[PDB]
Amino acid sequence: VLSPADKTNVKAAWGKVGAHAGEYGAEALERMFLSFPTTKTYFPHFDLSHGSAQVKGHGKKVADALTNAVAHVDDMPNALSALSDLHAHKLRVDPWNFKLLSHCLLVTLAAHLPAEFTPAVHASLDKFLASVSTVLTSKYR
Amino acid sequence: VLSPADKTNVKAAWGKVGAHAGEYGAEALERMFLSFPTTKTYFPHFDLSHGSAQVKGHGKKVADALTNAVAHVDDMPNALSALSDLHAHKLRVDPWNFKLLSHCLLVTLAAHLPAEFTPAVHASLDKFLASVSTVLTSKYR
Amino acid sequence: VHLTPEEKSAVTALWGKVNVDEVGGEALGRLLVVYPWTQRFFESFGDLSTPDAVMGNPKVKAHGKKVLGAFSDGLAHLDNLKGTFATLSELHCDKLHVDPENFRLLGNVLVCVLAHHFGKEFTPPVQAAYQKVVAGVANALAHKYH
Amino acid sequence: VHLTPEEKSAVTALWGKVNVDEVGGEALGRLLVVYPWTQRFFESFGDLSTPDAVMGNPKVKAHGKKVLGAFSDGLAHLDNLKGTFATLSELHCDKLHVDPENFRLLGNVLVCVLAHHFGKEFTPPVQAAYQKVVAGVANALAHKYH
Numbered sequence: 136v137l138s139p140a141d142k143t144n145v146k147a148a149w150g151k152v153g154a155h156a157g158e159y160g161a162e163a164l165e166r167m168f169l170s171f172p173t174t175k176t177y178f179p180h181f182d183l184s185h186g187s188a189q190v191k192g193h194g195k196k197v198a199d200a201l202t203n204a205v206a207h208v209d210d211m212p213n214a215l216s217a218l219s220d221l222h223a224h225k226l227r228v229d230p231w232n233f234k235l236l237s238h239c240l241l242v243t244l245a246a247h248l249p250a251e252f253t254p255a256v257h258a259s260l261d262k263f264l265a266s267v268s269t270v271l272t273s274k275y276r
Numbered sequence: 277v278l279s280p281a282d283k284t285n286v287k288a289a290w291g292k293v294g295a296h297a298g299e300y301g302a303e304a305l306e307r308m309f310l311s312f313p314t315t316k317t318y319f320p321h322f323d324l325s326h327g328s329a330q331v332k333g334h335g336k337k338v339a340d341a342l343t344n345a346v347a348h349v350d351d352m353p354n355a356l357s358a359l360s361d362l363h364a365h366k367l368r369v370d371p372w373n374f375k376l377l378s379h380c381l382l383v384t385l386a387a388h389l390p391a392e393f394t395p396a397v398h399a400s401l402d403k404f405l406a407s408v409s410t411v412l413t414s415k416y417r
Numbered sequence: 418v419h420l421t422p423e424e425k426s427a428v429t430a431l432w433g434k435v436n437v438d439e440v441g442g443e444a445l446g447r448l449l450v451v452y453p454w455t456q457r458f459f460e461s462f463g464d465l466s467t468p469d470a471v472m473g474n475p476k477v478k479a480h481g482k483k484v485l486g487a488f489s490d491g492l493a494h495l496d497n498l499k500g501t502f503a504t505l506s507e508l509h510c511d512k513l514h515v516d517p518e519n520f521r522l523l524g525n526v527l528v529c530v531l532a533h534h535f536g537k538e539f540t541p542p543v544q545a546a547y548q549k550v551v552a553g554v555a556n557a558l559a560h561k562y563h
Numbered sequence: 564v565h566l567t568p569e570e571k572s573a574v575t576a577l578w579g580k581v582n583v584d585e586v587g588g589e590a591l592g593r594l595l596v597v598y599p600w601t602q603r604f605f606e607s608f609g610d611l612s613t614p615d616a617v618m619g620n621p622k623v624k625a626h627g628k629k630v631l632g633a634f635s636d637g638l639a640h641l642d643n644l645k646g647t648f649a650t651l652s653e654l655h656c657d658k659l660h661v662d663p664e665n666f667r668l669l670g671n672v673l674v675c676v677l678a679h680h681f682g683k684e685f686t687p688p689v690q691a692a693y694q695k696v697v698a699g700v701a702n703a704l705a706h707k708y709h
């Protein structure tokens with residue numbers, strides 16, 4: 136899985152995101168709903184309009200989940216535990232959508248962290264998001 | 277991951293395969309090369325003709341890997357350990373191909389075990405193969 | 418989709434022996450059973466909480482018959498799977514908003530169902546010919562996207 | 564691919580400011596770097612053993628320019644991405660035998676490269692318009708299969 140180099144690359148990049156984690160998270164979500172409309176069938180009770188307080192509020196929750204995944208990068212399973220049943224069992228989210236969010240998240244990061252989004256850090260985040268997604272879908276198989 | 281029910285469903289089905297594990301494995305490979313030709317770019321030094329001794333000999337190795345994954349179903353990572361670097365690092369196999377082999381393997385099993393290939397056992401094997409593949413690609417992220 | 422005289426016979430010859438009734442719902446059920454997230458599209462079918470539950474579920478059996486029909490229809494117009502599925506595309510794409518990947522899954526479950534049903538008759542070559550078809554249907558069904 | 568007058572401007576306006584030289588190899592490099600299994604198709608390019616190694620690798624920079632060209636060419640004929648990529652399809656499908664999924668990956672890395680390059684200008688709407696394009700190219704490139 137995530138190597139020592141990846142682990143440090145992830146921590147660094149997220150450190151930069153800093154207090155913006157919540158707004159970047161709201162931005163990724165918006166990018167997804169726009170570029171990938173099928174993912175909206177999951178937020179019907181949401182006003183997905185641009186300056187939607189609901190979207191902004193959820194982007195914060197997503198960002199904090201990710202912050203926690205990083206803080207416990209060596210034990211994401213036990214940590215993300217709850218989030219796994221919610222997504223996998225409760226909402227039964229199509230696994231393929233995790234790929235779409237992960238992509239919009241990298242797009243968001245690349246549009247804010249020009250200095251940090253190097254090839255290596257890029258692959259690292261990919262692996263990281265790849266792992267986080269694996270856990271959130273771990274309840275499927 | 278694999279639940280108690282899955283674990284037992286997997287053991288049972290593989291038990292049926294029995295001594296045919298090697299021939300079913302050769303059959304899955306052949307199905308893959310035929311239905312999914314891009315996967316052949318990985319076996320250029322192979323005579324993929326029908327009654328190919330090479331194919332038959334490799335189907336045996338694949339089957340034994342799977343037999344071991346089952347025998348150590350609770351520790352596939354450490355067990356499949358070697359197979360992971362070989363595929364991920366050494367051969368750098370496109371992850372998507374693991375999906376194609378897993379599908380041909382289920383097709384092969386369904387064509388030999390009509391009594392056992394029930395919906396539930398089917399989902400179980402899927403989850404199992406899903407997991408085995410995850411490990412063999414674990415070295416990517 | 419192309420299909421050579423040989424691939425044509427292999428497919429058609431086999432398809433003729435299919436049971437329009439059983440096979441139909443068998444593929445749909447396994448789909449919902451093997452890929453649980455698909456159930457979210459058939460909540461109005463009742464208890465899908467268990468295999469026996471969905472496998473027996475009459476709404477499934479019934480809709481699966483319609484799906485089988487759709488395929489039979491595709492096998493007849495392989496030359497024009499596009500116009501053949503045009504309405505179905507709109508339905509699943511614009512209306513339902515199903516992701517293409519799941520169409521691929523249905524094709525593969527179909528393939529499994531058939532292998533299970535025909536056993537040793539579903540030789541590798543027959544499968545390859547059928548993967549071609551399924552691939553063709555899945556692409557046509559998802560045309561209302563690209 | 565459709566594209567509304569708005570989606571058209573958003574894409575074209577942005578595409579005009581692209582650096583045909585840099586951007587080209589940047590996408591290809593990251594691809595090989597982020598999805599290592601892709602390197603198996605460019606062993607004849609030398610040391611790809613490391614990011615700096617591939618990122619600097621001149622064969623990459625060079626081929627990436629050709630890829631960028633291919634896209635520019637697609638943006639010009641969105642109405643007929645099929646005939647526009649017909650030869651490229653054959654090349655990657657029949658000759659090289661690259662799996663479609665990897666085309667999708669290249670499109671997405673391209674998208675990332677552009678977001679990185681333009682930053683705050685690559686608004687969500689611009690991205691959506693570009694995902695449409697990339698989706699269209701990837702499908703056209705992989706037409707020699709279905």
Ligand code: HEM
Pocket residue numbers: 174177178196197200201218221222226228232233234236237267268271
């Ligand atoms: C990067 C992976 C993801 C993370 C970290 C994430 C995180 C979360 C978090 C923190 C919540 C809040 C739940 C709570 O309040 O306990 C949640 C809920 C949910 N997530 Fe995600 N999520 C992920 C991917 C997805 C995907 C791919 C979808 C589907 C397109 C999705 C759809 C939902 C839905 C619909 C809910 C419920 C929203 C509601 O409360 O009404 N999530 N997720």
Ligand code: HEM
Pocket residue numbers: 315318319337338341342359362363367369373374375377378408409412
């Ligand atoms: C179900 C997952 C798989 C299992 C259990 C499996 C197992 C194995 C085993 C046991 C070997 C023999 C290696 C040795 O002698 O140490 C091997 C080698 C290899 N595998 Fe697989 N494999 C899997 C998937 C794949 C896939 C998806 C591909 C690519 C289409 C693939 C391509 C190869 C290649 C090319 C080699 C080297 C063959 C050679 O010795 O020339 N394998 N695999």
Ligand code: HEM
Pocket residue numbers: 455456458459483484487488505508509513515519520521523524554555558
């Ligand atoms: C693989 C190819 C597929 C074929 C040939 C197919 C065919 C059809 C047909 C024939 C109908 C009935 C439409 C009508 O009444 O006129 C339909 C409805 C429907 N399909 Fe599919 N389908 C496919 C894949 C999928 C997938 C993967 C899903 C995703 C879960 C899906 C979900 C639905 C739903 C929910 C309906 C119900 C709409 C209604 O009430 O009629 N279909 N499909």
Ligand code: HEM
Pocket residue numbers: 601602604605629630633634651654655659661665666667669670700701704
């Ligand atoms: C995403 C769309 C893609 C575009 C637009 C594209 C475009 C091209 C172009 C313009 C060429 C040069 C052909 C010529 O010289 O006439 C080419 C060559 C090649 N492409 Fe791609 N390509 C794409 C995706 C891929 C992917 C994903 C791979 C897989 C690793 C790939 C592997 C190759 C290889 C190995 C060659 C070298 C052949 C040579 O020596 O010319 N391409 N591609």
